């Protein structure tokens, strides 16, 4: 029981988004925490100003994304195999039970970028106030604009995906129906 | 002899942690010690205060606690090999006996979570006063919040693999009942 | 369905294409922004100023065109897959499909190039005046002229899989007349 | 010819202590004498204290003893494979040679750590009077709390290997007679 | 259709060519940049003479050198899957067509490197005059001594690659007549 | 045709050679150049002390001696293979000429190592005075003392082999008479 489009189109984009964290990871947000620097004296003004304007990179929200989202197939591949060890539409409902969680973690991830980074965009110039910083200091950030280009790639991705997650539980009720 | 519950959800939370903790180890902790700073000029006080608040680091700790926590299974995998060889309810005995262990070994691991670090969340300041550092000094953790967030999934899912623990057992003492 | 010369010369020239990008990427532009520095006192500007001539990097957009190529195929792949299982020019018609979005991919990066990089050649000395930069200021690029023959052998492998790609299209229409 | 106990408990303690080996070497001795410094303005003076506290580190000890453990079990496979090959209690004798030259290797070696490394712990803050270092200055070791739980898992791990293998020739001795 | 020594000896050496630039490009050449320093106060002085003293590395040459002599044998592998696939001395000219390319490709190489590097030894101390150096400055080259005998090493295989080639077409013309 | 001692020994004795120069390389001379340091505010005099007193590094000879020591046994295998296709005391005379080989290989490489480093152990203190260093200059070389205990363990593992290969020509004699 699985659709037709969906195996070809689903897998295909997960592969691609893999493949671009993959690409993105080493090099692009590598040094973005080394190469953070504020025009100040004051120690440690850089990392905590770098912590209160990055909680968590982007490339870590993408491979725990990516993680949380490939867990249910992982699931249902485990209850699969185990199900065929014993043999030596209950898995019907379960399968549409995994695509609606892959689903969910996709839009709470969304969620969660938009609430820590509000735009796509990534600025040169931070002004940071936080303890120990003496009244607002200027920062700056490590490449903003592939970031920015990679940020693109991978929200557009993500929507295709919840797009198409949305068009596969369609399909399942009709075939239901 | 193995529930059927266990062998799909214990091992894909195993599995989660194990992609959890090498997402984590590269980046996060990386420059945990060599981005690690004090406001001193004293030489010598940052290694020592690094050494004081992080006597063991995180990463080190979980990955410690899955290679302890998966050698049961492995002395059972080598155990049901040689009877497998000699070939050409014990079993259920020492099945039970590691899952026990298993358990064990994460509770412990827990609590030595609790001794060392009390408190999920990681500040950004830290006071201090080990010698030779004179007086107290300030030192400044590096990403504290992101540390913070996979300390806190990390927790979660070895708190559900306890839990698993326990509903397993009862499950084995039931199927012997 | 699949013309002689295609599988034979359209893949050795991406595996030299992946073959050169490994080499370079590695080696060549690994220290591409660590190395950039400006001759200022001015705070950020190194930064800044490579974000400004340094958009996105050429390895990075190598990378993201091989996989924006290596797509459609890999789509087809999944689509043969999955007819292989359910039978456990349609097909003609996705080919050429797939290979017309191919040319197309392959020729939006080159404009993209175009765009972003006019003229091969890379310079020593750029001159940037973005903002904290004080009026205009001289920076140095790591190592343009191996960056310059990377450049020229990257595109000029692209063209020739442009060329071929519509001598594959010819072949297609031949065939079906 | 082999014991039931040794190769599934000998084969365990093995691989763990590989594990051990390869989350500890990474990242806790990395940086062993890169952040090693001593409080003075002499040249050289940290490279040659570091060389005197440390003639070999903790990980390269346990790197060479765990390739000398191996190395007559190497030899017996070698032997084995080369008398199946002929073929299209000698075998007990080699077998017991090559587990009594095991456990001398591990004494060996552990003598060998009592001699260089009296004390498993390791002090924060070292005297070197070496030359060129003038009169006696004070160094700092590079996580001394963290090398230590280390140094006492590999320990523990090598002693039970000791008596492990004294009860396995004992076995054999048994089995003799 | 191949030649009994030819199979044998280039496999051997072109093995041996890759193996030692594999030991090479790691350590050698890795700190070739970055421990190049010229005795000035010039900001930029450094990049740009190590870009005119070393337009291209001598790993990076003979990385593109290796690919494009490996390339015609793997479109004659290509070639021959296809052709195996549709029967699901024209072979004979493609083989020698593509020894011959082999050999033009060994001996263009060459020539690049006598152009860039005339004479095989590598200097400590370098005269650089680019803009904006002022006057004359004195640069030094990193490991230079090991630098040449890996030159020497790559130059001599190559050498005889070249006279291996010409041999292998003598045969395959020896045995058309 | 091949003594039963040899293909034991010979291949137990490499596979550990090769081993320890894998747990060497990596971490022991890893940072051989980057730590050298001389008491001297002369630039360029660092790189060139180390060039002078480092031609090639000990881990690079002895990758170099690997390889050409197992480049006749990888001709005889190409050979055998070849041999094997065209089937679809020869071979006694190209393996021992291939055993004396090896041998010669193996004995020249040390001598080239007694011409390089005349002495097993390093010292902590070198005295250079290579243009531009002016007078005499100290400088330290890092990790001395395992480096000398690598050293030992490398030696005599190829006089081990150097012997081994004697006898192992001496047998094939033997075994013609």
Not at 119 to 129: E, P, Q
Not at 137 to 160: H, N, Q, W, Y
Request: aromatic letters at 14%; one cysteine or more; a neutral charge.
């Amino acid at each position: 029981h699985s659709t037709a489009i969906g195996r070809v189109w689903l897998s295909v984009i997960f592969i691609f988004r893999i493949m671009v964290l993959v690409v993105a990871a080493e090099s692009v947000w590598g040094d973005e925490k080394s190469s953070f620097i504020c025009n100040t004296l004051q120690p440690g003004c850089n990392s905590v100003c770098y912590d209160q304007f990055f909680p968590i990179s982007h490339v870590r929200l993408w491979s725990l994304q990516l993680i949380l989202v490939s867990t249910p197939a992982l699931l249902v591949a485990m209850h699969v195999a185990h199900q065929q060890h014993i043999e030596k539409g209950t898995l019907w409902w379960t399968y549409v039970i995994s695509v609606v969680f892959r689903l969910l973690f996709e839009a709470v991830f969304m969620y969660v970028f938009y609430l820590l980074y509000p735009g796509y965009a990534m600025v040169r110039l931070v002004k940071c106030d936080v303890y120990p910083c003496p009244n607002t200091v200027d920062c700056f950030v490590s490449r903003p604009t592939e970031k920015t280009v990679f940020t693109v790639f991978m929200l557009a991705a993500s929507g295709i995906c919840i797009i198409l997650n949305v068009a596969e539980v369609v399909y399942l009720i009709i075939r239901a129906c």
